[PDB]
Amino acid sequence: QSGDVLSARYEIVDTLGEGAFGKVVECIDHKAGGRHVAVKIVKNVDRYCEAARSEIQVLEHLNTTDPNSTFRCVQMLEWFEHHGHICIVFELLGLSTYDFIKENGFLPFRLDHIRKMAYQICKSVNFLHSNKLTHTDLKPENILFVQSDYTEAYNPKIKRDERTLINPDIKVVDFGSATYDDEHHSTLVSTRHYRAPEVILALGWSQPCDVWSIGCILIEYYLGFTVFPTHDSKEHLAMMERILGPLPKHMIQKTRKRKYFHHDRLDWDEHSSAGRYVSRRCKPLKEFMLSQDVEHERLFDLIQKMLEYDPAKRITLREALKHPFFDLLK
Numbered sequence: 001q002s003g004d005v006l007s008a009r010y011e012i013v014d015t016l017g018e019g020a021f022g023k024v025v026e027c028i029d030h031k032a033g034g035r036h037v038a039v040k041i042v043k044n045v046d047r048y049c050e051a052a053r054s055e056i057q058v059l060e061h062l063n064t065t066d067p068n069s070t071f072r073c074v075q076m077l078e079w080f081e082h083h084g085h086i087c088i089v090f091e092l093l094g095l096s097t098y099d100f101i102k103e104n105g106f107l108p109f110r111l112d113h114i115r116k117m118a119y120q121i122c123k124s125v126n127f128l129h130s131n132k133l134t135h136t137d138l139k140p141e142n143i144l145f146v147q148s149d150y151t152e153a154y155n156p157k158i159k160r161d162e163r164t165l166i167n168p169d170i171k172v173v174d175f176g177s178a179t180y181d182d183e184h185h186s187t188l189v190s191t192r193h194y195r196a197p198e199v200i201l202a203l204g205w206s207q208p209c210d211v212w213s214i215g216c217i218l219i220e221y222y223l224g225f226t227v228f229p230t231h232d233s234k235e236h237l238a239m240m241e242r243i244l245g246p247l248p249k250h251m252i253q254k255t256r257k258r259k260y261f262h263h264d265r266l267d268w269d270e271h272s273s274a275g276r277y278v279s280r281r282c283k284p285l286k287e288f289m290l291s292q293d294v295e296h297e298r299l300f301d302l303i304q305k306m307l308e309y310d311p312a313k314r315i316t317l318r319e320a321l322k323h324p325f326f327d328l329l330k
Contacts, residue, residue, distance in 0.1 A: 001025070001041075006087050007080045010039055017096070017141075021048045021176060022085065026092065036092045037077060044084040051176035052086035058133065058175040059088070071127035072120050074144070074173045093171055094148030097221065098140035104163050106224040111295055112328075113168045114221045117143070118302075119326050121214055124172040126317035129207040132181040135172065136189035136205075138213035140220060142174045181206070193226045197240060197247065198311045200233055201255035208311035211320070215306025222299065223288060229281055234260045238268045238275070240309075242282040248309050298325040 004012045010027035013036075017024045022043040028034050042052040059076035069075050077089040095103070097117065109117065121143060128135055135142075150163035179185055189199055189209060196212035198205050219227050227243055230236045237260055241247060252264050261267055269275050285304055289296050302325045305315035315323075 005030075006039060006041075006082045010037065010087075010089070012039070021051060024090075038090040038092050040088040040090065041082070042086045042088075049086060052088065055174075055176040055178070056086075056088060058178045061131065062127075062175070065131065066127065069171065072124040072169075072171045073127070073175070074171045090173075093144040093146060093173070095145055096141050097143045097145070097170065097217075100145065100148055100163075100165070101140065101221070101224060105160075107158070107162055108224040109168075109221045110164070111222075111299065113165065114218065114299065115325065115329060116168050117170050117221065118214070118218050118299075119321070119329055120170050121172065121217065122317045122320045124170075125210050125214065126321060128178065129210070129317055134179050134181075134205070134207050135175070135177070135210050135213075136179055136186070137174055137177040137191060137194075138172075138210055138217060139191045139194045140217055141191075142172065143170050143217065144173055145170055192231065192236065193220075193228045195236070196311065197237070197251065197309055200236060201251055201257050201260075203251060203254055203311075205311065207316070208314045211306050211314050211317060212311075214317075214320075215303050218299065218303050218306070219288070222290075222303075227282060227285075227288065232274075233257075234266070234268065235274055235278060237266055238278045239282045241266055241268070242278055243285050244304075244307055244309065251309060295325075295328070298323070301325070 002012050009029055009031040011030060012025045012027055014026040015023055016026050016038055022041050024038055024040045027037055027039050029037055042048045056079050062073045063076055066073065074093065075091040077091065079086065079088045125135060145165065146169040147167055149166045151166065152161050152163055155162045177189060185205065187202060189205065190196065190213055194213040194216045196205060196209040199209055228236055228239050230239055247266065249264060252261055270279060286300055289300055302320065302323045308314040
């Protein structure tokens with residue numbers, strides 16, 4: 001679709017990204033001196049239309065309450081329709097955190113960068129939580145750098161060239177799943193590797209499912225890989241039990257997902273091929289730590305609080321933002 005011209009001013013010059021919903025494109029703005037914007041072009045399909053209108057209503061609310069994006073939600077510039085596609089015009093951001101890690105060889109972020117990015121993610125999502133909103137789809141693809149300009153130094157430790165961001169500031173994108181407290185809550189939310197246990201067990205969810213997602217994002221930034229390399233619900237739960245310990249009995253008793261359980265325990269054979277896979281790939285959370293220094297211990301203390309099984313006990317982002325992991329920032 002490159003060369004197409006939206007609303008008689010936006011010329012598509014590149015695809016930034018692609019999704020169930022449609023795509024995000026980079027356009028030249030012929031009416032603002034040629035400067036570049038992002039345009040989300042949503043498929044001409046009811047469910048994607050409804051989610052785009054929902055996203056526009058959330059962005060009008062967020063952009064009105066916080067017009068300078070103090071809380072780091074992407075800025076919507078305008079919206080329109082084009083051949084029955086809803087088009088949302090955004091400030092042009094740089095790469096996703098995912099694309100950055102990928103283009104760098106799945107080398108993790110330095111702890112100092114993770115500290116800054118985690119703070120900003122927590123500050124951004126807490127702003128939603130303060131406005132009776134839950135994002136529901138937090139993942140590294142939905143966390144974008146403001147500018148993804150980097151320097152390169154040879155790193156003798158790894159014997160190769162690595163990229164360090166000049167500025168690691170981020171914004172949160174994709175409000176098409178965002179849900180107000182008083183609205184219908186989808187049965188299934190989140191991308192699987194970031195999905196909270198109350199979602200897998202169909203117990204109901206609210207703001208704390210976002211906190212679980214953030215805890216999984218921080219592990220990936222720290223390791224460069226997920227600790228949940230799965231595409232199966234029961235196996236995902238077996239992996240949580242290996243990393244975090246047994247599920248709470250009250251959550252097992254409450255679930256109607258009876259296929260995952262035998263008696264009141266996960267129906268999981270550690271001696272099966274899948275069982276060996278989970279035993280090989282997954283291990284107690286603190287075993288993933290690359291260093292024993294206090295900075296590392298405090299990140300893992302935060303992570304473990306975010307990956308509390310019981311969403312009623314899980315750390316809130318208001319409590320996260322005061323975690324000692326974040327002092328070296330103030």
